[PDB]
């Protein structure tokens, strides 16, 4: 039971938290990357004004 726990110990102490922090930062990036997309949408909003005259 201990070894099954040890495999889990390894996972939980060294893998899950790194994967979790990596996930965290990478989700911050996909949150924030969707938001960066929203920044290019703002670039489109600028375009949208130029196109009024167009």
């Amino acid at each position: 039971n201990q070894e099954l726990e040890q495999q889990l110990c390894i996972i939980e102490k060294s893998l899950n938290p790194l994967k979790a922090e990596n996930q965290k930062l990478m989700r911050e990036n996909n949150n924030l990357q969707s938001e960066i997309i929203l920044s290019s949408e703002n670039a489109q909003q600028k375009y949208n004004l130029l196109t009024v005259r167009l």
Binding site: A20, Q23, K24, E28, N31
Partner: peptide, 16 residues
Amino acid sequence: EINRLKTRLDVGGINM
């Protein structure tokens, strides 16, 4: 709502 979740991710085990 989002950061917020960033903190939740900083605090707990991301709903594994």
